[PDB]
Design a protein around this ligand. Structure first.
Ligand code: HEC
Length: 124
């Protein structure tokens, strides 16, 4: 839910600030850029988080590999997101590894979850 998501932003901010002292607080601008940024897959094809989750994380997504819909990421819209707090940190680490080849950094996670807190309305 939103409660657990918000608490994770503080957790990852404090980890990030220890590792990278110039980082002090989340940037929702940077979280949004991270979500939409086209990165290069090994093949040379570009992809972004938004390729599967759409450019609005309040919307239902679609996996470009399998065609399967994906529930929204924004926890105000899909309140199940982040409720499974014993597992969701490990699951996010696994997912970053799957999509990008390595875990997302603590500042990337703080910025991204803070951005998710701000996306409360689906695109119509
Ligand atoms: C399609 C190939 C995807 C791309 C590119 C990214 N994600 Fe994804 N994401 C995808 C699926 C099929 C799933 C699992 C199904 C589900 O409903 O959870 C997810 C899930 C997430 C989650 C939720 C994790 C959890 O609650 O356990 C998050 C926060 C998430 N995805 C974020 C995310 C980011 C930041 C991405 C770019 C680095 C990204 N995803 C890419 C499919 C795909």
């Amino acid at each position: 839910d939103v409660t657990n998501a918000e608490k994770l932003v503080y957790k990852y901010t404090n980890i990030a600030h220890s590792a990278n002292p110039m980082y002090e607080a989340p940037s929702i601008t940077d979280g949004k850029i991270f979500f939409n940024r086209k990165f290069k897959t090994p093949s040379g094809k570009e992809a972004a988080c938004a390729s599967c989750h759409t450019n609005n994380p309040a919307n239902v997504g679609k996996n470009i590999v399998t065609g399967k819909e994906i529930p929204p990421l924004a926890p105000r819209v899909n309140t199940k997101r982040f409720t499974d707090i014993d597992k969701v940190e490990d699951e996010f680490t696994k997912h970053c590894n799957d999509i990008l080849g390595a875990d997302c950094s603590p500042s990337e996670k703080a910025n991204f979850i803070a951005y998710l807190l701000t996306e409360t309305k689906p695109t119509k």
